Amino acid sequence: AYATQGFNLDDRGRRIVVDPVTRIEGHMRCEVNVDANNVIRNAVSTGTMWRGLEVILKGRDPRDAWAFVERICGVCTGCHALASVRAVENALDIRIPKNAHLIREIMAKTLQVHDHAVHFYHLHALDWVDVMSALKADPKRTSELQQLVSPAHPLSSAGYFRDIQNRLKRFVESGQLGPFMNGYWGSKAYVLPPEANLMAVTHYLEALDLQKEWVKIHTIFGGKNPHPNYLVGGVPCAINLDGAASAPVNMERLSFVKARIDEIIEFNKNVYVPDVLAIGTLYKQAGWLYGGGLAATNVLDYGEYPNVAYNKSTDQLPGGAILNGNWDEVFPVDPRDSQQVQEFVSHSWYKYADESVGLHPWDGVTEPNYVLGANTKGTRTRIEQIDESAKYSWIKSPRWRGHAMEVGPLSRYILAYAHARSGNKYAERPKEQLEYSAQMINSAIPKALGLPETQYTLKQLLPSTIGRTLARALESQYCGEMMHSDWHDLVANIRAGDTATANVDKWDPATWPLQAKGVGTVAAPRGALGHWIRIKDGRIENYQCVVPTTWNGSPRDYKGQIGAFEASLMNTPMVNPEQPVEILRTLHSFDPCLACSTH
Amino acid sequence: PRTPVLWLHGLECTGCSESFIRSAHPLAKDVVLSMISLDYDDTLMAAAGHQAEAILEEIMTKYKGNYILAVEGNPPLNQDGMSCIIGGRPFIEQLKYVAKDAKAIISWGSCASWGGVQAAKPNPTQATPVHKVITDKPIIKVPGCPPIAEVMTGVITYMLTFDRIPELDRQGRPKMFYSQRIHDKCYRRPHFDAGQFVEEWDDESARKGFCLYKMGCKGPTTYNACSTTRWNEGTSFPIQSGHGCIGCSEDGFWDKGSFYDRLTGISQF
Numbered sequence: 001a002y003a004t005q006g007f008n009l010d011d012r013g014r015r016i017v018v019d020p021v022t023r024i025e026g027h028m029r030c031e032v033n034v035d036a037n038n039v040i041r042n043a044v045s046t047g048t049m050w051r052g053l054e055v056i057l058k059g060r061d062p063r064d065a066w067a068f069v070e071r072i073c074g075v076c077t078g079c080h081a082l083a084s085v086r087a088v089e090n091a092l093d094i095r096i097p098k099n100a101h102l103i104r105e106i107m108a109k110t111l112q113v114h115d116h117a118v119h120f121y122h123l124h125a126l127d128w129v130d131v132m133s134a135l136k137a138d139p140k141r142t143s144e145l146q147q148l149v150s151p152a153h154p155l156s157s158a159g160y161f162r163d164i165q166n167r168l169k170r171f172v173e174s175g176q177l178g179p180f181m182n183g184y185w186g187s188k189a190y191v192l193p194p195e196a197n198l199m200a201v202t203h204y205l206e207a208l209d210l211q212k213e214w215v216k217i218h219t220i221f222g223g224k225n226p227h228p229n230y231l232v233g234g235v236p237c238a239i240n241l242d243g244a245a246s247a248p249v250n251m252e253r254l255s256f257v258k259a260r261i262d263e264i265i266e267f268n269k270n271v272y273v274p275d276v277l278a279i280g281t282l283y284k285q286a287g288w289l290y291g292g293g294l295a296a297t298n299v300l301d302y303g304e305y306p307n308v309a310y311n312k313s314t315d316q317l318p319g320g321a322i323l324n325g326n327w328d329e330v331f332p333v334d335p336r337d338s339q340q341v342q343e344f345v346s347h348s349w350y351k352y353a354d355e356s357v358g359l360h361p362w363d364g365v366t367e368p369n370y371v372l373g374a375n376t377k378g379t380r381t382r383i384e385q386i387d388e389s390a391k392y393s394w395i396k397s398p399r400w401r402g403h404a405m406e407v408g409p410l411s412r413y414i415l416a417y418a419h420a421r422s423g424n425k426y427a428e429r430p431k432e433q434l435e436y437s438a439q440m441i442n443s444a445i446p447k448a449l450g451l452p453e454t455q456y457t458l459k460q461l462l463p464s465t466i467g468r469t470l471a472r473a474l475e476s477q478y479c480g481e482m483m484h485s486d487w488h489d490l491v492a493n494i495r496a497g498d499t500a501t502a503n504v505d506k507w508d509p510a511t512w513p514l515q516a517k518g519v520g521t522v523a524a525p526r527g528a529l530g531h532w533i534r535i536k537d538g539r540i541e542n543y544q545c546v547v548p549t550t551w552n553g554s555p556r557d558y559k560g561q562i563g564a565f566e567a568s569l570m571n572t573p574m575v576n577p578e579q580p581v582e583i584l585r586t587l588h589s590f591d592p593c594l595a596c597s598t599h
Numbered sequence: 600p601r602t603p604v605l606w607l608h609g610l611e612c613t614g615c616s617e618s619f620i621r622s623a624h625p626l627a628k629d630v631v632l633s634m635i636s637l638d639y640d641d642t643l644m645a646a647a648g649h650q651a652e653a654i655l656e657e658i659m660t661k662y663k664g665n666y667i668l669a670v671e672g673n674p675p676l677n678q679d680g681m682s683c684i685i686g687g688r689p690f691i692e693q694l695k696y697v698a699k700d701a702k703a704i705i706s707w708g709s710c711a712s713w714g715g716v717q718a719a720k721p722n723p724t725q726a727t728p729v730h731k732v733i734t735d736k737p738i739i740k741v742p743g744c745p746p747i748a749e750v751m752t753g754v755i756t757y758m759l760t761f762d763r764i765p766e767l768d769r770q771g772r773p774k775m776f777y778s779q780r781i782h783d784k785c786y787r788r789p790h791f792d793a794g795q796f797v798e799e800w801d802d803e804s805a806r807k808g809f810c811l812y813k814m815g816c817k818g819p820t821t822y823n824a825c826s827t828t829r830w831n832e833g834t835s836f837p838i839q840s841g842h843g844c845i846g847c848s849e850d851g852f853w854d855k856g857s858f859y860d861r862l863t864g865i866s867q868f
């Protein structure tokens with residue numbers, strides 16, 4: 001047992017293993033210890049995959065890198081491509097044209113929406129929603145619930161909910177439950193009434209059908225989804241508004257994109273945000289405010305979405321770092337500073353010359369070292385209980401000035417809130433969303449459902465699994481709104497006569513400096529993403545990625561400090577220690593992408 | 600009534616799973632609820648840990664030699680196989696265990712089919728395609744990074760309707776989807792035939808939709824349905840949106856030189 005970051009870690013209790021962790025991207029193992037009352041008193045995050053993209057990139061052409069690193073992940077598809085082209089452009093002093101900037105922003109915001117909405121419904125919702133309970137719901141009461149939760153959503157009649165309920169029923173009555181087989185249905189950890197469950201399941205089905213439409217924006221600009229194409233110096237989708245049909249982008253293609261954006265805005269406003277507000281309210285009323293972890297103290301994002309390109313002071317999700325829960329002081333974060341972002345491997349399956357220090361990613365090293373500690377139960381190829389006192393993950397341990405940080409939509413919303421309080425006007429919309437959301441959760445939704453009003457502040461409500469889930473939904477809404485404005489600006493710029501989509505001045509490596517280094521950052525769906533590159537004689541000398549889930553899923557560092565996943569699980573009661581309902585609910589609130597975390 | 604699919608994930612990016620759920624005809628929703636029984640799939644399944652693992656035994660017993668094994672990604676042979684760990688054991692052990700009683704095996708995507716990005720030089724994990732590990736079962740390769748959504752569901756639909764694997768080419772790919780090179784029906788072909796090429800990004804030729812051969816387009820050597828079926832319900836494909844094909848359905852495309860290096864012997868095509 002030891003204490004770190006205010007958490008009292010104790011591994012003397014009953015050990016519980018969750019392997020595989022499902023409804024995530026990629027491969028994770030989680031172990032916890034619980035005390036005599038089933039409260040988690042230790043948590044262990046193990047990334048269970050590695051591919052070695054950083055090693056594979058050595059010696060290749062920087063112009064090709066984006067395509068390799070894009071394949072780090074098909075869920076956050078394109079965010080790595082964006083970081084890569086930014087990193088190469090930074091290294092080579094390349095400024096992309098305005099239309100390329102706007103198209104990339106629209107693609108990024110499209111990914112945010114798609115990734116957030118699919119995550120919540122198809123990966124997260126079954127931690128909050130009991131599908132078998134939905135079978136017992138009254139269709140009439142479900143219709144009435146729907147009208148209170150989201151008055152503007154047109155799909156609200158009793159017959160519509162009866163139809164969905166019956167298909168679900170027939171499916172279950174078949175005896176082949178598919179994705180619902182061996183679920184934790186009926187657990188007391190589930191608190192929603194049947195009507196709320198049926199509403200949510202119905203939206204799970206609606207979103208599965210709709211998500212395929214949103215990504216057609218990627219298809220227009222990048223050819224395909226998953227894995228749309230990017231380009232060092234701009235975008236490949238050349239513009240000819242007028243032989244119009246022969247160019248990748250003409251007015252009709254832009255109108256198509258706008259139609260998809262308008263649909264996105266509708267879905268976020270009428271389905272996604274209201275569902276999360278309603279589910280959050282009900283779990284809040286049940287007292288389930290666990291899972292805050294490091295969000296209560298330390299949060300980080302690089303900052304993103306400048307309304308003036310290459311001017312970070314105009315970031316619409318302004319970033320930086322908060323420490324010790326002091327929301328009155330946002331420290332600037334510089335990805336170029338060797339003393340800020342650093343990665344440790346003390347408890348990771350890698351080796352450094354000296355593992356008592358952290359390496360900034362321009363000096364990063366990726367040499368595998370799969371070895372298990374002396375207190376392991378089982379063998380090298382058959383682990384029963386992992387030894388977290390030694391090396392226990394394929395995930396490296398990123399820290400900021402040595403501090404363990406949480407990253408993600410929640411981090412960005414806390415930072416935006418802090419920025420807005422300090423007088424930053426670019427953060428006014430997220431501040432508004434948060435204040436609106438607090439009032440809905442505390443007062444409006446309780447009043448409408450006949451529940452008592454509460455008086456939680458944002459500082460109390462946000463650092464929690466509920467809060468983490470809420471911030472994701474709000475971010476989706478904000479990204480939809482922002483890309484709606486980006487579309488107008490793109491169309492306006494083209495109509496003014498600027499059709500440029502690529503700067504090719506430094507496309508040929510004969511124009512390059514013989515060595516260079518660059519960094520590209522992105523506010524990826526799961527948090528702060530960076531790619532750091534060194535170029536030598538036209539080739540990649542080093543390429544290091546530090547990815548959002550690398551931060552959140554980090555194992556312990558040299559100092560034994562715990563990362564976001566491990567901290568978030570601490571001090572959480574489990575209804576039944578052999579059913580990981582609460583572990584899954586909190587882990588999933590981070591939207592873990594394990595392929596990302598390890599690359 | 601509904602054929603079980605056990606969908607396993609090795610070393611992968613999850614792009615093949617994502618592509619699958621973009622299918623419009625049929626809807627993935629209808630595939631899951633009405634066509635297959637998707638009984639194991641890490642991305643979507645309610646059960647985790649011991650409860651998830653327990654499903655594999657149950658389905659394999661009850662539906663012995665009558666389930667489809669679908670594989671996204673691949674097994675690593677380095678690090679004693681523990682660069683991909685499932686249930687504290689190497690992924691290759693799960694793959695071999697589930698494969699032995701499968702009616703048919705689908706290798707989804709370039710990773711499962713050929714090695715994928717992780718198998719590109721120097722292949723630190725010795726990632727190995729499914730057919731080099733499972734040598735005694737019928738395997739259909741559905742390559743692409745990822746494959747087109749409707750190609751993935753088209754394979755499932757054929758297999759469910761006929762209870763047969765569709766006719767395959769020498770490389771194990773379905774002829775109904777992989778018989779044509781991209782270049783055969785690519786709408787920019789008349790430009791290629793007229794020697795009309797893009798030479799620099801966003802030049803006048805690019806704005807007129809000229810052929811992308813000189814920008815590295817690998818369409819002339821790449822077999823897929825992209826130029827006809829196209830992507831995301833026929834919305835576009837790489838070439839229509841202005842980037843050359845990078846050859847993503849072809850074996851070892853990652854190590855066939857820069858994506859922007861043109862093919863040589865233009866007379867060939």
Ligand code: SF4
Pocket residue numbers: 071074611612613614615616671672707708709710711715716743744745746
């Ligand atoms: S083929 Fe491509 S898209 Fe599919 S699971 Fe491999 S890297 Fe990802």
Ligand code: SF4
Pocket residue numbers: 781782783785786787788789791809810811812816817818819838843844
């Ligand atoms: S080289 Fe590429 S762009 Fe040109 S016609 Fe062939 S497939 Fe189309």
Ligand code: F3S
Pocket residue numbers: 224743744781821822823825836837838843844845846847848
């Ligand atoms: S890159 Fe791949 S998606 Fe089709 S156009 Fe070429 S085979």
Ligand SMILES: [Cl-]
Pocket residue numbers: 086101104
């Ligand atoms: Cl950019």
Ligand SMILES: [Cl-]
Pocket residue numbers: 709710713714715716718849850851852853
């Ligand atoms: Cl390959």
Ligand SMILES: [Cl-]
Pocket residue numbers: 855
């Ligand atoms: Cl070749």
Ligand SMILES: [Mg+2]
Pocket residue numbers: 054396544545546547599
């Ligand atoms: Mg890294």
